[PDB]
Amino acid sequence: SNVVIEDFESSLTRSVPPLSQASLNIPGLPPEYLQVHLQESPVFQVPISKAVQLTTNDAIKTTLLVELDISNTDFSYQPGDAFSVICPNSDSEVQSLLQRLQLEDKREHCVLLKIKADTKKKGATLPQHIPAGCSLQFIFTWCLEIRAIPKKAFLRALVDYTSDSAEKRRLQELCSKQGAADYSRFVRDACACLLDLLLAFPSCQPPLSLLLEHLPKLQPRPYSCASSSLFHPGKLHFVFNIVEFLSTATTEVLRKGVCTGWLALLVASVLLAPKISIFPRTTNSFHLPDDPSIPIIMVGPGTGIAPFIGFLQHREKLQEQHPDGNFGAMWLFFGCRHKDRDYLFRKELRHFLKHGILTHLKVSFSRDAPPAKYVQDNIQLHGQQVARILLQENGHIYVCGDAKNMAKDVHDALVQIISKEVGVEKLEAMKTLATLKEEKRYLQDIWS
């Protein structure tokens, strides 16, 4: 059976009218500046000691808990801290890209970089994220975000290395004024990366120097500390969903995130310890109050629960040291899709409640058939207690998780709560929350 495409079908490689017949306003070509020669020749490395799948096998998103052994380091952390993980690109992706650039057989050559004597770029400097003299393999694996969506100026540069007339034309369309919609749809929304484009435009043969002028730094990914060193001394836990998304890939439907895809591969045999390189974030503010008598409210749907597991572990240990202490209330608003699939830490939370560490637990299930569906609905149902904690009892509220929408939804809920509870106008309520934030009693750790 043949792949047969009808005349009306547009795609990354094919426009339809009007764009296909349009006069193009094409951006100016970026001035090349890099000269490449291929020469033949406070970071902590910590083992992964444990990994646990927290979700059922049929959960739409797979959530993992990973334990790192920090015992042979001088690394320290407090609950709510974040740290950065240094991750590589997929070996298969790096191989495919080097193969496509006809560079696979030079993968062990050292990349020596200079500025071209004859460049028309002012202020041209060597990219700081490409270590001078490292192997091509090393640079593609560890230094370059090969997943990055090519900008219009990168597409513009690739026009000049594309020999097929229709393919060159399509790339002109994709970087032009007139091709804005097609770029947004077929490149940006589609999450297309360089390899995807080069496979889609087989006649595009760009030089390595051009890639190194456009591919950005491969950034480390931060994770939140999901444990207390009081509770698991010498260990550090973190929790993450494996990211999976639809892309331009022709032979694969879902692509995994760079860091979470790698972590999942690393821990397969632990689920000869695998090791990863991490480093602390110098500033961290998402912390328990110094005064343990102060009541707190934690709002952490899905994996946003992560730092709060660390807060609760910390308080368990603090309480063990000092029974009879004046310890403030601890409220958790947790949300997930299905009680029977992704109710993270269900047993541990039960433990915290049983022992009087967690004062109140309010869990919402957004996809179970019927009741509060999201954390914001449950917060509203307990508005009186929430208002009193924040406004009469000097309390703090913490909101963590991947959605910025979640953060806005929680915010708007609190606005409604303060208006109704104190009986002030929506505007005074909004300014109260802003003053709460200014005083560091309303804290956010938002992940996207």
Q: What is the DSSP string of 256-293?
A: E-HHHHHHHHHTTTT----EEEEEE-S-------SSTT
Domain count within the chain:
3
DSSP string, 337-392: S-TTT--TTHHHHHHHHHTTSS-EEEEEESSS-----SHHHHHHHTHHHHHHHHHH
363 falls within a domain:
yes
Joined together, the tokens standing for residue 174 give: 């994709």
The resolution, in angstroms to one decimal, equals 1.9
Active site residue 400: yes
Could you tell me the CATH number of the domain that includes residue 15? 1.20.990.10
Nearest partner of 410 among 448, 389, 383, 428, judged by Cα: 383
Q: Which helix (H) or strand (E) is 197 found in, with range?
A: helix 194-200
The domain in which residue 440 lies consists of 294-448
| Residue from 205, 226, 223 nearest 87 by CA | 223
- The residues after which the chain has a C–N gap greater than 2.5 Å are 41, 271, 370
> Residue 148 falls within a domain, yes or no?
yes
224 and 337 inside one domain: no
Q: Is residue 1 part of a domain?
A: no
Domain boundary among 167, 186, 219: 219
Does a structural domain hold residue 4? Answer: no
Which of 202, 219, 236 corresponds to the end of one domain? Answer: 219
230 contacts 321 by C-beta, under 8 angstroms: no
Q: Rounded CA gap, 107 and 119, in Å?
A: 27
30 and 59 within one domain: no
Q: Is 331 a catalytic residue?
A: no
Is the same domain home to 334 and 421?
A: yes
Measure the CA–CA gap between 287 and 81, rounded to whole angstroms: 7
Whether residue 349 is found in the same domain as residue 228:
no
CATH code for position 81: 2.40.30.10
Q: Say if 287 falls within a structural domain.
A: no
Last residue of a domain, one of 233, 253, 281: 281
Q: Does a structural domain hold residue 337? A: yes
Q: 440: domain CATH number?
A: 3.40.50.80
Check 224, 227, 229, 364 and give the catalytic one: 224
Question: Cα(334)–Cα(53) distance, rounded to whole angstroms?
Answer: 19
Residue 12 DSSP label:
T
Q: Which of 204, 364, 400, 419 is catalytic?
A: 400
115 and 183 in a single domain? The answer is yes
Residue 275 and residue 46 in contact, taking contact as beta carbons nearer than 8 Å:
yes
Number of helices (H), then strands (E), belonging to the chain: the values are 14, 15
d(CA 146, CA 281): 25
Peptide bond into 18 cis (omega under 30): yes
307-310-311-313 Cα dihedral, nearest 10 degrees = 160
Q: Write down the residue that tokens 């606005």 correspond to.
A: 415
Residue keyed to tokens 């505007």? 427
Distance separating alpha carbons of residues 407 and 396, to the nearest angstrom: 16
Residues 245 and 315 in one domain: no
Method: X-ray
Same domain, 312 and 377: yes
- Are residues 131 and 246 part of one domain? no
Residue ranges at the known binding site for FAD: 221-224, 257-260, 447
Task: Report the largest interatomic distance among the alpha carbons of the chain, rounded to a whole angstrom.
Answer: 80
Measured CA to CA, the distance from residue 72 to residue 45 in angstroms comes to 9
* Residues 210, 92 share a domain: yes
β pairing state of 221-224 and 275-280:
unpaired
Annotated binding site for NADP(+): 61, 366-367, 374-376, 409
Is 447 one of the annotated active-site residues of the chain?
A: yes
Considering only CA atoms, which of 153, 149, 163 is closest in space to residue 197?
149
Residue/partner pairs of 174-177 with CB below 8 Å, 24 or more apart: 175/26, 175/27, 176/22, 176/24, 176/25, 176/26, 176/27, 177/24, 177/25
Asked if residues 198 and 204 have their Cβ atoms less than 8 Å apart, the reply is yes
Residues 303, 362: one domain? Answer: yes
Domain-embedded: residue 201:
yes
The rounded distance, in Å, linking the Cα atoms of 70 and 397 is 30
Residue 160, domain member (yes or no): yes
Measuring CA to CA, how many Å separate 106 from each of 41, 136, 218, 349? 11, 7, 21, 53
Token pair, residue 123, equals: 């202020």
- Concerning whether 1 is annotated as a catalytic residue, the answer is no
Looking at the fold, whether 366 and 400 belong to one and the same domain comes out as yes
**Are the C-beta atoms of 310 and 337 separated by less than 8 Å?**
no
Q: Are 244 and 275 within one domain?
A: yes
